[model samples]
Target: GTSKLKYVLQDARFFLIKSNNHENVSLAKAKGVWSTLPVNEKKLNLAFRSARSVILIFSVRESGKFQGFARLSSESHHGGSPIHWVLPAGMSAKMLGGVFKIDWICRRELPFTKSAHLTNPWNEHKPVKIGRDGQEIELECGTQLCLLFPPDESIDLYQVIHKM
Candidate 1:
């Protein structure tokens, strides 16, 4: 949820050289590092039969919400925490082929929607409103967007997004 963390692209060659011997990700050379590991060509080919490369790009700005609560201070050992995504393996690669972030959503009953709600505190966020004089009215909704990675092996956003 700490949006303070930024996402930037860098030279894959230089990135590999600089981060080839690091532990966390400080030694690395760009933002949005440790996103996703590089998958084998065969696997990636199957993942994308028609596309040349699939890069996910979205704003990491603040929606006045925490991206997730998988705090770096947690004592758990799941490596499934949000921190894992913040500092993934391949900290390089501008075009994260078939690997990147996804857009987030707000829960109908927010702050406690998903099982990871505790590990990742949720935020329903606010929505923009609009109206007209007896003509028509519409509400322009806007919440902090989120991102998914590697995607589900066999599912789509329609199959997972709960209420948010």
Candidate 2:
């Protein structure tokens, strides 16, 4: 049972997407919507199959500051080639595809210099080690920390962010 649980826990994968426009960030925070340009559908589908969960971290393209993160809802639309995702409820659409919501937990601007990179075709950041079940990650100013996927629901998000 423990080994099976471990395998399931290890199935989560992380990716980063950087945005140059602050408007996009503002819109995301306001309406709970985010997106990316067209990415390879085969790779994305494969990721979904193997990983089961895909978490995307949003960053400032110019400053390299992390804004927040959200899980990729399987509800995302993929009518067009290369796949597409859209937040179902929103009327105002900025971009066409890969729409996500900040429903899980969004963070304030956090600066991470050596943000660990997971190799994905859609990743904006340079390649680094893929985040795993219990990997220690180094931040901008030498603060060492580990990332928790599908974060423990028993703990409050505010408490976790405050501790960080």
Candidate 3:
């Protein structure tokens, strides 16, 4: 008989984007960009289909700086050449692509530096450095990225909810 096991699932996903790429970034801001899936498309599709929301982080390829972040529309459609997502009307196109003068709010809340934890559907533990003085990394289409920060009890969820 096969062994039995249990597992938990996640609803939110963190994604990275190349801010310098005006063409695709523009699409992401205007509508949505094409997503690149891993070899095992099945698992990715399942997770994305069930995902309630996604966090979009813009990064500059040259400086490795994380420009800004925004929320992606919860609804995602799978079809055509590649998967794509639509941005909510609340998201401003002007704020989608740009360099932030101040540091990201998450950076301050999290203990780590500018570098964020990188991962995909197939691979976990892929680490990469980011930020002005960080290492430059190449980002491909559909690559999921995030800064793995420890939970902070001091955080005020009400404030976050109000801002969003």
Go through the candidates in order and give the clash count of each. Answer: 14, 2, 2
State which candidate, 1 or 3, has the greater TM-score: 3
Q: Would you estimate the TM-scores of all the predictions?
A: 0.17, 0.50, 0.35
Task: List where candidate 3 sits over 4 angstroms from the true fold.
Answer: 1-10, 21-48, 74-113, 116-124, 129-164
Predicted model with the maximum TM-score? 2
- In candidate 1, what are the lDDT values of residues 76-160, reduced to their tens digit? 1222324322333645443233322222221111221222212211123212111111111011111121222122222223321
Per-residue CA lDDT of model 3 for 1-164, tens digit only, reads: 00100000024544454444434444444443434323222333443455543445565455435544444433333333431333445544332332211112232222224344442322343544333211222333122233333323333334333333
Which has the greatest lDDT?
2
Which of 2 and 3 is the better model by TM-score? 2
RMSD of every candidate to native, in Å, equals: 19.2, 10.1, 12.8
Q: List runs of model 2 lying over 4 Å from the truth.
A: 1-10, 40-45, 78-95, 114-164
lDDT (C-alpha, whole model) for all candidates? 0.21, 0.43, 0.35
